[PDB]
Amino acid sequence: LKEPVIVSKMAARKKITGNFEFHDPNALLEKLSLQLGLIWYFDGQAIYIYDASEMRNAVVSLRNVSLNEFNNFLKRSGLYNKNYPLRGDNRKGTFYVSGPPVYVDMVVNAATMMDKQNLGRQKIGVMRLNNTFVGDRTYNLRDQKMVIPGIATAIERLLQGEEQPLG
């Protein structure tokens, strides 16, 4: 194995003996983790090895980021481990994670540090009217003036005040 190996001290009390030949180490470590009862994880720099009774789990809620986006963050970074995936709904905020303690405490911390990291640009539109007039019309009945409100006064009074979530 081309990486250093960090064996914990609760899985350092078990013993082994016998003539071992290393000609396929990635399958020998996978077989011996099940025959001895162990969990292991390789994050890209080292291989951590714990015994099976140290596996912890947690459920964490993402307020404003989807699971399919966080899972693409793990696929693009290199921490995606297909043995211990993320169980949860595909477009939601809640999921369930379990595995080694160095993988759980990285996924929880990098998910609550992605809720802590998480607007609309203004735009001017011009709408030409083909069958009506903007602006008011005025006429007289021999002494008095009558003013009729146009289309630009009717919509301006409709959106007046109006602390309302329009989308």
Binding site: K9, R13, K14, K15
Partner: protein, 211 residues
Amino acid sequence: NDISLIALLAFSTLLPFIIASGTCFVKFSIVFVMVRNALGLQQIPSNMTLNGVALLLSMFVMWPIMHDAYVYFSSLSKHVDEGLDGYRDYLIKYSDRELVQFFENAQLKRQYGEETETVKRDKDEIEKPSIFALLPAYALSEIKSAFKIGFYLYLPFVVVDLVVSSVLLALGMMMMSPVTISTPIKLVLFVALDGWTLLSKGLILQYMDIA
């Protein structure tokens, strides 16, 4: 800051409680008193002194083990378990195997019932005993070991006293207390043998090593 003095009056009695109960101070105080009774002195050398010299050698040995509990520092009890692995390993090495198994089985018989399976020796490879079974068994295993050293230390002086009481009965001096003659010549056996630099030289080597 006097609202935490109710816990200070607990922590300033619990810190000498582990010293007088569960560390190596128990062996040094028993050996140092039993060599005072071996010579035959009552007051001197003033065991107020001997509880200071035994505490200086016990803090001498307990200094690297206690310091790892400070480099670290329902839910806080699993945090203090990681902080208390060196003390449990020191208590395992020097307690008795047949006595920890008694305090382990009497605890399981206490908690679950009389139909509990009896724990045997073959747990010792991967399973570790609790801190409430080592701590009563360590004190008794050092009372047994210090009384074992003190009987050996006791023997030469008794050889002096039984010849002194024999030669004072060869002569017709039966109305003569042999303490007043033996107590000078019982003191030469402790200064020509320089046993103060031999008991402290050996009791340190039982727990630590040189070079």
